[PDB]
Design a protein around this ligand. Structure first.
Ligand SMILES: *[C@@H]1O[C@H](CO)[C@@H](O)[C@H](O)[C@H]1NC(C)=O
Ligand SMILES: *[C@@H]1O[C@H](CO)[C@@H](O)[C@H](O)[C@H]1NC(C)=O
Ligand SMILES: *[C@@H]1O[C@H](CO)[C@@H](O)[C@H](O)[C@H]1NC(C)=O
Ligand code: NA
Length: 179
């Protein structure tokens, strides 16, 4: 339905900008609306007043709308409509905001007794995990990664986790004399 997809982080702020715009005198009204609830979240009705539905919102002179501290409820299609003094619609841009939880630093666990190693990430939406040993790719996975060996070991393992909004990483030197 012609919207510009946008990714935002649960808990962080985000900015919806219209580069296609450049403010001026002729401009009489800039309206930002939230589709699903059909409600104007912010509006620049000339100096006549600066309306904002909440502190969660902020609208700038350049038409950019900042949404503070993203929450599950903010995933929605947003629309800006802006008009001059002669009543004309100068621009209309639409954004399709989806949000994800930032990923957390992965956690690596292991026993030398049982030749087993695990990498897991507790926080993060639809993450992707990669396991490396002394800089060489082991496995890619969406769920928890397991890695078993047999010999005595003294490697440097690296586990990455990432999604659309973040990337975290953890390296842990492993030494199993096993005897
Ligand atoms: C609009 O202004 C804000 C700061 O007031 C800035 O963060 C944003 O990048 C600007 N966008 C444009 C298109 O000027
Ligand atoms: C995991 O996410 C929760 C909120 O969803 C937060 O309280 C906690 O601090 C996060 N942990 C990390 C390591 O980011
Ligand atoms: C680890 O190895 C021991 C033998 O040394 C075995 O008995 C045990 O089942 C293994 N641990 C797990 C969790 O399977
Ligand atoms: Na919102």
């Amino acid at each position: 339905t012609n919207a510009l997809e946008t990714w935002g982080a649960l808990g962080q702020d985000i900015n919806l900008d219209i580069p296609s715009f450049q403010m001026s005198d002729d401009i009489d009204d800039i309206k930002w609306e939230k589709t699903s609830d059909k409600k104007k979240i912010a509006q620049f009705r000339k100096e006549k007043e600066t309306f904002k539905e909440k502190d969660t919102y902020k609208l700038f002179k350049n038409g950019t709308l900042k949404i503070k501290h993203l929450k599950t409820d903010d995933q929605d299609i947003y629309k800006v409509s802006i008009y001059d003094t002669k009543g004309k619609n100068v621009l209309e841009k639409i954004f399709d905001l989806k949000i994800q939880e930032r990923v957390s630093k992965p956690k690596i666990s292991w026993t030398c007794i049982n030749t087993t190693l695990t990498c897991e990430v507790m926080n993060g939406t639809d993450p992707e995990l990669n396991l490396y040993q002394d800089g060489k790719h082991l496995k890619l996975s969406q769920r928890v990664i397991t890695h078993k060996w047999t010999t005595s070991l003294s490697a440097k393992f690296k586990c990455t986790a990432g999604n659309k909004v973040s990337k975290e990483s953890s390296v842990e030197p492993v030494s199993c004399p096993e005897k």
